[PDB]
């Protein structure tokens, strides 16, 4: 079953946190909740909507992106290795905040679609265990 304050959905427990943490920090708070807990992994439509419903029913402010467990593994600003002309991408000059390699949910899409955002943003999140 679930701990006090955690909602169950198909054998898992979820809890929305209204703390403004970065992706790594958010993931850390989940990991501290239980051996096996992490940020939420949306793995089906029904789960997508449960989470969407959880967020709108538990978060006092829907003005931010809510972090979910999907992100790019590595320290790469982009994974396309060639320009459209064939050349290799050697030189780069990215603004650190432009590499939106972490994902979140937002009101504009009803917390059902995943949005590309800068991992260094401070957003609330959902943990799943």
């Amino acid at each position: 079953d679930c701990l006090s304050g955690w909602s169950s959905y198909e054998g898992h427990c979820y809890k929305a946190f209204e703390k403004y943490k970065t992706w790594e920090d958010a993931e850390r708070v989940c990991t501290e909740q239980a051996k096996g807990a992490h940020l939420v992994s949306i793995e089906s439509s029904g789960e997508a909507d449960f989470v969407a419903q959880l967020v709108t029913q538990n978060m006092k402010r829907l003005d931010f992106y809510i972090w979910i467990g999907l992100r790019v593994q590595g320290k790469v600003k982009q994974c396309n290795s060639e320009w459209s002309d064939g050349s290799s991408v050697s030189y780069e000059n990215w603004i650190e905040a432009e590499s939106k390699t972490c994902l979140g949910l937002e009101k504009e899409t009803d917390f059902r679609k995943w949005v590309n955002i800068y991992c260094g943003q401070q957003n609330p999140f959902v943990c799943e265990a």
């Binding site: 992994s41 949306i42 793995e43 439509s45 593994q73 982009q78 990215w94 390699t101 899409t109 590309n116």
Partner: protein
């Protein structure tokens, strides 16, 4: 050697365009604009600075596509819980890189969106 309307920098011809297009269309437009035509590629900081001021000189304060698309589509996306990424729910299909004519800093924008652009070719 540049056709009087395209500008030269280190053996290459560059040219900014006014009509806003999505990345795909803009890339395809450049190809039809000249043999070996493509959307601008920055191979150095000095080439970047040339194109940026060229773009500003030609059309002022706006945003322009560079020849880099679908930037993260091929990355290794993993759910922190090691769950297989099967179900997908991307709000935006793919992002492309563009520059704003105020500096040579790189920025991302969803490829389906509008922006002006700079094409280039070798000759």
């Amino acid at each position: 050697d540049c056709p009087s309307d395209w500008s030269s920098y280190e053996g290459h011809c560059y040219k900014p365009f006014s009509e806003p297009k999505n990345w795909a269309d803009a890339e395809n437009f450049c190809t039809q604009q000249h043999a070996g035509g493509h959307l601008v590629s920055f191979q150095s900081s000095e080439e970047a600075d040339f194109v940026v001021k060229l773009a500003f000189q030609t059309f002022g304060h706006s945003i322009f596509w560079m020849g880099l698309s679908n930037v993260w589509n091929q990355c290794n996306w993993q759910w922190s819980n090691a769950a297989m990424l099967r179900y997908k729910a991307w709000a935006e299909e793919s992002y492309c890189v563009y520059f704003k004519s105020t500096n040579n800093k790189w920025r991302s924008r969803a490829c389906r969106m509008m922006a002006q652009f700079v094409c280039e070719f070798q000759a």
